[PDB]
């Protein structure tokens, strides 16, 4: 009751979240310096223990947050994200987790209010995009299957798999080395390969243009009214 | 009369189109697995016959649809598309048709209502573009002819044909390896080649920008009113 | 007087301009077929004389047009363009003119009304762009001079001239092989070369974005009112 | 008093700033010609002294400007820029300053009113971008650290440093040789490298799209009202 009110008044105070922010920036500087190998021979003893103390502080502070807000902490996406980040950082995963630990720096966007505002502004335009995202995914899946069965035996590196055909169709979509890297080599053996790729590029570019216009008229519809 | 009303009540029922949708997704999974050669040695006997039964079901179900709606089925673009897809899938074409058979997966967009809504939204912005499309096609045709007669003998691979000059001008338009892949090699022998290509890129980029702005002010004109 | 009224009624009749249009499309087909060398061994005798008769018809028909409208023909940009095109096509220029002759196909846009409408729509957005065009040209000129004097001796092919530095800065602007083609080779000898090019790319991209937004708010300003 | 009023009437007269403008354009022509080495053997004696007289004139004329407007000259960004430019041009820096001297040509934008108007129009859209700029910088910093610690030992040239990982992530962002130049070489040894780069590209492209839409709705918000 009084303990609760006092400890919640600590958890949702400014100085608490500010202290967490400043641990975040200091530890961001830390992880920036830890990529330097000469630096690590000299100061690795210190930098590792600094990461240890920040992570215990974070785990304690989500213990307090989750104490204050039991169900609503798990109903809240930002705190859900802080939980899952410190949890990943807490697990001892074949070293692939060491690189995942630096995701804790993303907590900066959850701790600081303006960053939180812009990333929710970013997520909010995604609902309107689901229709075109699914249209494009189906178009890519149908074309990936055709590109695989058309070019897979003679070009195993680029189209031998459904997965590699996704990859290289996605490359083509970004128009990166499309004709010189993939189409023209293909035409040295399959001469009408452009019949598959020119339409692919045209439809993909037009749908991608329509995606971005679709966004604007949404941000404008909330504006003119 | 009563038979008609009963069989039309079956054809335009939800469960019918839903069953067709679920055959579509199952067969999409099927065609996804059929690109895998090891999978096919094991289960090709089954996967081929699954494709056989889905295609007979589709042909039966367009027989029913076309029965219900004789003229209007052929006046309807989505059903016209389903007809032509199953028809392609029904024809025994030098194996080039085997890859065309996976176009049947596109029926998913015609069967499901939201996909149908977004692709007609996509087609509908095309009318407004016809003017600029034809302007660009004429500009490409005039430039393709000049690039052919300017660079064709000394660069047969890139400009020896009107068709190859279309191709490589289209490549340049996507700005993919423009100077490094085509212009600079050309300048090693024809030093003023940039006089042809820099304007080409400028006019092409400006017209393409104007295309996309042209789209927005159309989607906005239906909005502000 | 009556002769005038009758011959002007012929020049500004539909069938006259339509006949000119159909000569244009036939001759476009002609010039398309003339790039084919095997075709020319067979039918070059005919195709050349077809180009001769169309060009005499065009010169006669601008003689009539300029007869009808003396000063205003020269005050009119479309007719100014037809004049200069047939004039180029009439001059016997070291064969560089043979390729310029196909510019006569552009007369199609001047003869047909809808094409004329869209290309003036295209020209009309250019006035608003003069400010940013001149800002960019000054920025390119200042940077081209620095890139020349910084990298010209050790990289004569890319930056040895002010002209070659324009060219390759323009290439960088289109982001085509920027780091792999130019920056990274430069850094193998001049390690801080990115200090010149990263800002260049940032400012160039931001100004180019601002150019395109600048266009939209103009096309919208004529709309919301 | 009277001297002041007379000398301020000279400094803020048109002909004064116009004369400075014409020195600027003449000296721009000069610096354009100075990159030419054959030109310099012939006329370098003259061109260097021309640059000497223009720079003394500029230093005198900012002496007069700063005389007229003591505090407000330093409170004014355009005059602050002219000051710092002539000051750089006045310092005798291991020849790295010789190339910086051509920045004096940028004074043209500060002297001429329309250029001044468009560049402040350009700066003014930057405030609204700070939120997304900082979001992207944090995302790049977190990913640069992961790309360094994931790929640095086996790819020292592209990811051996935090700085080189910034560079090549920025390259990927411009989609320049992404898969062919970096991802596919990486996959020859680290096969799941796309799990790092495909998301990177998706999030980076979406945030960059949102940046540009963010700009438009700002330029439109000042318009519809
Ligand atoms: C919002 C996010 C802001 C991001 C701003 C980023 C500012 C820093 C970017 C770093 C750019 C330079 C990196 C670099 O040059 O790397 C070199 C070293 C590794 O080399 P090293 O092995 O030390 O080689 C020594 C060679 N020697 C003896 C001749 C000197 O590698 C390093 O030493 C890297 C040192 C990085 C310092 C950390 C900077 C933290 C900035 C603030 C981030 C806080 C937000 C979480
Ligand atoms: C986060 C919010 C929404 C995100 C929007 C995108 C959502 C859809 C994402 C794609 C869904 C399909 C994923 C997929 O098919 O994965 C297949 C492959 C498997 O890779 P793999 O076969 O292991 O790679 C081979 C390379 N090797 C052997 C030499 C190592 O892995 C890949 O190659 C994937 C390549 C990129 C595929 C992108 C597909 C784009 C579809 C439409 C995207 C939206 C456009 C607006
Ligand atoms: C709206 C459209 C949604 C699209 C979502 C796409 C999700 C699936 C993307 C597939 C990405 C991965 C593809 C891939 O990795 O290919 C590998 C195999 C071929 O290799 P394989 O010859 O089996 O090599 C065996 C090697 N061994 C023995 C060591 C294991 O190739 C395969 O096995 C591919 C298996 C694909 C499964 C089908 C997935 C269907 C997803 C739902 C689509 C329904 C809408 C029509
Ligand atoms: C679906 C809705 C509307 C679509 C908008 C585009 C409509 C216009 C499409 C193009 C019309 C002209 C087609 C054409 O000229 O085809 C010529 C070539 C023939 O190829 P080919 O000579 O067999 O290729 C040689 C390569 N080889 C020998 C080594 C195998 O084949 C090609 O290389 C074609 C290359 C692409 C040409 C694109 C022309 C773009 C014009 C404006 C496009 C619209 C921009 C908004
Ligand atoms: C608004 C503008 C519309 C533009 C639509 C463009 C439609 C035509 C695009 C041409 C695409 C194909 C070009 C092509 O494949 O070139 C091959 C030949 C040159 O090869 P050739 O030397 O004949 O080799 C013979 C080989 N052999 C004996 C085994 C057959 O090269 C040719 O034969 C080219 C023939 C082109 C025919 C002219 C088409 C005119 C279309 C309408 C344009 C009118 C508007 C002015
Ligand atoms: C039509 C309506 C308005 C058009 C907007 C653009 C207006 C401004 C155009 C550029 C003005 C300056 C032209 C210029 O500086 O020409 C220099 C070079 C000379 O070439 P050169 O030195 O012969 O090339 C060397 C290659 N080699 C020896 C191996 C054969 O030739 C080039 O390399 C030129 C390269 C492209 C320069 C583009 C400069 C862009 C400035 C801002 C463009 C507008 C962005 C919105
Ligand atoms: C708003 C900004 C407007 C910018 C407009 C730019 C117009 C000029 C662009 C220059 C493009 C051509 C550059 C070029 O071709 O470079 C060649 C020479 C260096 O070669 P060089 O060593 O002379 O070789 C001689 C070879 N020989 C004996 C056989 C003739 O290199 C040169 O001679 C370059 C000469 C450039 C002349 C200066 C042009 C000033 C234009 C107005 C700028 C005023 C605003 C500040
Ligand atoms: C002017 C108004 C606002 C401007 C917007 C951008 C503001 C943020 C800029 C970037 C801040 C971080 C700078 C940084 O981390 O510098 C690190 C490296 C150090 O280079 P270094 O390690 O010496 O390069 C190695 C190459 N070598 C050894 C072979 C010579 O140097 C680099 O490689 C930098 C590479 C480009 C980094 C761009 C980061 C973009 C973040 C978001 C950009 C805004 C997107 C809208
Ligand atoms: C919504 C729009 C949908 C657009 C869909 C378009 C699909 C069209 C795909 C075109 C694919 C072209 O791929 C085509 O494959 C066949 C099948 O082997 C090749 O066929 C042949 O190739 C060469 C011929 O010199 C030989 O090695 C061999 O005799 C044979 O395999 C064709 O020469 C090639 O051009
Ligand atoms: C709406 C805008 C329209 C823009 C249209 C612009 C068209 C301009 C095209 C410029 C083309 C340049 O192409 C030009 O071709 C001629 C004709 O052989 C070459 O001429 C020469 O090339 C080299 C010279 O070293 C020699 O091999 C040879 O003696 C000769 O063929 C020129 O050196 C080349 O620079
Ligand atoms: C069936 C679909 C209907 C077809 C019509 C749809 C449009 C298709 C256009 C062809 C696709 C290739 O698209 C190519 O993309 C590149 C991207 O670098 C464009 O380059 C772009 O540069 C600027 C700067 O970003 C853009 O504002 C502009 O849209 C475009 O000019 C090429 O100018 C464009 O041609
Ligand atoms: C509006 C924004 C304006 C932005 C303007 C930015 C301009 C900055 C330009 C940075 C250019 C870097 O170019 C720099 O040139 C000098 C001058 O030789 C090189 O200096 C040195 O290079 C290498 C060093 O290993 C040696 O061969 C040699 O001893 C020497 O020439 C630098 O190492 C290089 O990094
Ligand atoms: C006669 C025509 C009038 C000439 C003026 C018309 C504009 C011409 C611009 C030069 C054309 C090259 O166009 C080049 O396209 C590339 C596409 O990757 C742009 O790169 C682009 O990145 C972003 C992200 O998409 C775009 O929002 C932006 O438009 C542009 O900066 C280059 O910045 C631009 O310069
Ligand atoms: C907001 C979104 C955030 C997205 C973040 C995504 C991060 C995911 C990064 C995936 C990185 C893949 O990088 C992965 O690195 C490990 C660690 O060595 C490699 O592991 C192995 O590589 C090869 C295996 O043949 C061998 O040389 C060796 O035995 C081993 O090092 C993996 O095979 C590689 O695929
Ligand atoms: C001082 C200036 C202020 C700096 C901020 C201005 C923005 C600078 C951004 C960095 C420039 C590189 O710009 C790079 O252009 C490429 C063009 O292929 C973009 O790729 C683009 O793809 C799509 C499709 O066209 C565009 O709608 C979008 O704008 C962008 O994501 C990269 O995502 C972008 O990062
Ligand atoms: Na490229």
From TrEMBL, chains A, B, C, D:
Residue stretches spanning the membrane: 14-33, 45-68, 80-97, 118-146, 192-217
Full-protein residues shown: 1 to 226 of 267
Residues where Ca(2+) 1 binds: 174
Superkingdom of this protein's organism: Bacteria
Binding site for sn-glycerol 3-phosphate 1: 32, 36
Topology of the protein relative to the lipid bilayer: Multi-pass membrane protein
Subcellular location: Membrane
Span of domain Ion transport: 14-225
Swiss-Prot/TrEMBL keywords: Calcium, Coiled coil, Membrane, Metal-binding, Transmembrane, Transmembrane helix
Name this protein carries in UniProt: Ion transport protein
Residues involved in Ca(2+) 2 binding: 177
Binding site for sn-glycerol 3-phosphate 3: 161-163
Source organism (scientific name): Aliarcobacter butzleri (strain RM4018)
